[PDB]
């Protein structure tokens, strides 16, 4: 159960983190290059 | 050849200097990949009997609109018989070697005829070839036993 | 065919794939009359130098004439710097274009020879003294015809990129 919480952490936070960081970074660069 | 997962061609198992082949090519019922277990000469001698008994008891499977499974079981158990005869001939006593490889040749020519009859969905010729190949299957069964 | 000294090969790949290996072009080199050009050509085998013919193209093809190639920096016929710095001279035009299958090195004019060569196909004996002439094909002239018969374009380039896949010193010498 500890291993399951650890693995779903690794999935939701720091490998879904990259997949969601692509979009967060695209939003952020869009707003930046919109206001700069 | 890096230990785990040999790569590249994925080679076939070889044919060790035997005349068990056809001489107009190697053979046609050969299944490409089968895990023939390297048991030992008694184990090969018994597994020949078992696969020949299978091919012998494949009598019920034959019929109209069933020849595909006949061809599949044929080429499978004949591939097992091929590699087992290869290891038996290569580990023979050199006095029963020649009759045994002639037996294997006259058995495998008949397996080739049977595969040619079943792959082409020829039922009557399949059975008419199954007659003498059944004679040969009982012959190898009473030889190994 | 005066004293083939060094056999060497570059194997080509016509068409869309890069590693099809459409035959090979085994050539002999007259390493006694022309030391500079033959030593250059042996070096352009990438043996001791990062720059070399490996990956370069045959950037000009003309029917019933010569197939040029041997530029590796560029692909048009500009970057052809030799091993001797950038560009070296011509040497002792003793022999002639014997006809099909020569390895005359390409230069703009006098005393400006680089990396680029051209494989002759038809008897062009009227390049003597202008371009240094050496080398000869000994296996694969039908591959040269296979290069020649390719449909060219406005720029006299082959429509299919005729790339050299490898270029190594053969064990003859």
């Amino acid at each position: 159960r500890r291993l399951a919480k650890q693995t779903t952490f690794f999935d939701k936070r720091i490998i879904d983190g990259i997949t969601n960081g692509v979009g967060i970074t695209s939003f952020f660069v869009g707003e930046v290059t919109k206001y700069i | 050849d890096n230990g785990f997962w040999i790569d590249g061609p994925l080679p076939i198992p070889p044919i060790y200097n035997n005349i068990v082949n056809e001489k107009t090519g190697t053979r046609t019922f050969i299944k490409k990949g089968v895990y023939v277990a390297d048991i030992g000469t008694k184990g090969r001698m018994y597994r020949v009997k078992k696969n020949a008994f299978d091919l012998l008891a494949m009598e019920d499977l034959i019929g109209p609109d069933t020849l595909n499974y006949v061809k599949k079981y044929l080429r499978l158990k004949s591939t097992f018989l091929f590699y087992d005869f290869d290891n038996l001939i290569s580990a023979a006593a050199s006095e029963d070697k020649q009759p045994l490889t002639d037996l294997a040749n006259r058995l495998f020519d008949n397996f080739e005829k049977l595969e040619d009859a079943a792959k082409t969905k020829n039922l009557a010729e399949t059975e008419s070839c199954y007659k003498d190949t059944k004679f040969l299957l009982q012959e190898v069964m009473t030889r190994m036993a | 065919q005066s004293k083939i000294t060094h056999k060497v090969y570059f194997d080509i790949s016509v068409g869309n794939p890069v590693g099809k290996l459409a035959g090979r072009i085994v050539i002999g080199l007259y390493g006694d009359d022309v030391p500079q050009t033959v030593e250059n050509f042996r070096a352009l085998c990438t043996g001791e130098k990062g720059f070399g013919y490996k990956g370069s193209t045959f950037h000009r093809v003309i029917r019933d004439f010569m197939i040029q190639g041997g530029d590796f920096e560029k692909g048009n016929g500009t970057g052809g710097k030799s091993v001797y710095g950038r560009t070296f001279k011509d040497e002792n035009f003793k022999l002639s274009h014997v006809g099909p299958g020569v390895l005359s090195m390409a230069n703009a004019g006098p005393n400006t020879n680089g990396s680029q060569f051209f494989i002759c196909t038809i008897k062009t004996s009227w390049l003597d003294g202008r371009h240094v002439v050496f080398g000869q094909v000994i296996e694969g002239m039908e591959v040269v015809k296979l290069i020649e018969e390719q449909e060219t374009d406005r720029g006299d380039r082959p429509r299919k990129k005729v790339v050299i896949a490898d270029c190594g010193q053969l064990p003859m010498s």
Binding site: - | - | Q68, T78, G109, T112, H131, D156, R157
Partner: protein, 145 residues
């Protein structure tokens, strides 16, 4: 002098120059088949231009396109107009034709270093240029103006 813009070509057929009365070293190699070079239209040519010793400095194959020139109306060098059309009865070019030219400096860019961008020049003084014209076609839609 310098700035050859190194482009190693193969060479062209040598032939003797049947000189002209205007000093032009004129040399026909392959006579074209088609319409004559018209005075005043855009014509597509290919060429390799060489200095006295034979070094190449400009070529239309270097940029991989025929050169579109308006001949006759002085948009080009007088050597080019007099070696393409012919003023003193020199035969003009046809389409698909080839021709060698030894342009003298009286017709070429004089004793003037034509083209001097930084320190050194594209052409030196008294160059006595050497052109190898390959007339490829007329421009498909062209005017005499």
């Amino acid at each position: 002098a310098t700035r050859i813009d190194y482009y190693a070509t193969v060479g062209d057929p040598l032939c003797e120059y049947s000189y002209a009365k205007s000093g032009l070293g004129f040399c026909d190699l392959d006579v074209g088949f088609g319409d004559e070079a018209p005075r005043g239209v855009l014509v597509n040519i290919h060429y390799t231009a060489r200095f006295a010793d034979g070094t190449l400095f400009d070529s239309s194959y270097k940029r991989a396109r025929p050169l579109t020139m308006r001949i006759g109306v002085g948009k080009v060098i007088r050597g080019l107009d007099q070696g393409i059309l012919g003023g003193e009865g020199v035969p003009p070019m046809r389409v698909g034709g080839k021709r060698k030219l030894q342009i003298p400096p009286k017709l070429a860019y004089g004793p003037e270093p034509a083209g001097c961008f930084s320190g050194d020049c594209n052409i030196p003084g008294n160059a006595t240029l050497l052109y190898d014209i390959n007339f490829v076609e007329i421009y498909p839609g062209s005017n005499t103006r």
